[PDB]
RNA sequence: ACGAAUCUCUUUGCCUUUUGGCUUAGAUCAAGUGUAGUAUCUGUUCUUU
């Protein structure tokens, strides 16, 4: 949390240092994104998903749909 | 032919849906995309009129 804490405060500072203990996903590391460990993989795009229909006015309406 | 009434048009008269403020003209004139919608395009084919 006072990790979290004091990189909150470096963003609004925009004094960032872009630094990772862990390395990311990238296609070499791919191989080893899984290695007998319990994971779980998380994405958020099809979360808000909208039907855009016109209105009275004739400016567009976005309403949401089931994500 | 004169008088009158009815109708149509033309000339004029009437403006009869006929400009309802002020400021520094009140101020400043852009660099966008994909996705969707909407309208508008244009072609495109065929049908029968």
Redesign the pocket.
Known sequence: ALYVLRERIRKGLQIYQSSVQEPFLNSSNYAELFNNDIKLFVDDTNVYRVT???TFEGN?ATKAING
């Open positions: 855009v229909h016109k567009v």
